[PDB]
Amino acid sequence: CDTVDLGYQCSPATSHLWGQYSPFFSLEDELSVSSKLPKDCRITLVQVLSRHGARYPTSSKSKKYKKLVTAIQANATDFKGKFAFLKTYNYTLGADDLTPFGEQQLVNSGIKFYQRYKALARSVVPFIRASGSDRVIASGEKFIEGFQQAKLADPGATNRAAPAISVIIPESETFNNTLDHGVCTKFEASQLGDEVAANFTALFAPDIRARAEKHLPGVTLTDEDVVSLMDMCSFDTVARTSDASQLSPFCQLFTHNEWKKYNYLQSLGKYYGYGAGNPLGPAQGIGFTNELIARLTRSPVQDHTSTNSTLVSNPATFPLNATMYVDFSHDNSMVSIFFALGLYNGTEPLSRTSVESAKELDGYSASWVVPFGARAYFETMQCKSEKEPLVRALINDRVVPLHGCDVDKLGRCKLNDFVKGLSWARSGGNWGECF
């Protein structure tokens, strides 16, 4: 179901419509040119930004879910049609940790990285950091495991030492961490994403609630419980087998039309939570953007947002010449980073009353952009076509054409043009508003 190259391709009419809880699916050639290395080009640097893999719900949501399943089982006088399974369903999900399927997605991601960049990766041990969350660290470890699986199988690799995770950045409201938001006080108090999500859920959940209630006489559901039962389709699917080879019984409770509403609900929460919809959302990605610019230009970091000046100024924790960098993060920071980088500056503000496809949204959606196991590659390449290095961004294998610079038909800008166009981030954006 899940493969190294394509990601997850089982039940795609449903499993690609779970927003950030979809398993990564490759978007190669989707509303995009090919991601292949263009003719007469050589990659000279690649930064990877990866989310952790498929996981259990957080302890908070896992509690909520289990409470709800228990109340259904306590309350229902019957379990009719497709709801019959709920009679005997045993809630066994954990909390926070990767599932075994999620571990394997990250090993696959490491294999794909080595294969895609084999020319470089044969001699390079990437410099790796993870945000200090156990599932993020564990994802980094499984990605290294995959990368080395591939590397040791290639008799042409010369530099075979395994990479370590060199920096684990603490997650704290008081620690400047560019791979997880937390310090920007005002933004942390924002309720906008949640209010947009609740207001949208109020539009679509009532029909589904009526229908679920009709099949579960005795039960009363809130619109929130509707969304919980939809969330359980992805969580149970990624936990119930090691290879996510069995779609959860929760999934068939809801129609394909309803899945496209759920998918949009998730795109809404991320856009108004962390993307350009939130007035401080892209500011959360400034720190990483200035770290990437330092890496792309081989120059010291210039930033006063969420970088830590101790960590960026020591080459042990922030080398400027490692050629391959891999950083592990979370969905919501990755959303803010991609928007800080201007990669979604063709996406107009999301309708809060109609579902717009990732195509009307210029390739933006939570499942296209921050699935479980999401990855972005930011490449520099030297092409016979040009003196200057050219930059390209790939998000889940979709070429996402750069904004703010003179972009070509392959989605590329010259490096210094790209960096000049990132003037908002380079100047610290509206980070002052945090305080």
Ligand SMILES: *[C@@H]1O[C@H](CO)[C@@H](O)[C@H](O)[C@H]1NC(C)=O
């Ligand atoms: C910066 O990182 C140093 C090194 O671990 C740590 O002592 C300090 O508290 C961090 N400061 C902030 C604000 O993140």
Ligand SMILES: *[C@@H]1O[C@H](CO)[C@@H](O)[C@H](O)[C@H]1NC(C)=O
């Ligand atoms: C939530 O409820 C109503 C829907 O009409 C709206 O006027 C209010 O502003 C909403 N909050 C947000 C952020 O949309």
Ligand SMILES: *[C@@H]1O[C@H](CO)[C@@H](O)[C@H](O)[C@H]1NC(C)=O
């Ligand atoms: C942490 O970030 C704030 C800007 O948000 C800055 O005032 C402070 O100097 C930073 N501290 C470190 C150690 O980077």
Ligand SMILES: *[C@@H]1O[C@H](CO)[C@@H](O)[C@H](O)[C@H]1NC(C)=O
């Ligand atoms: C993207 O649009 C925003 C909002 O207009 C602007 O602040 C930013 O500079 C643009 N980014 C790029 C890289 O063009």
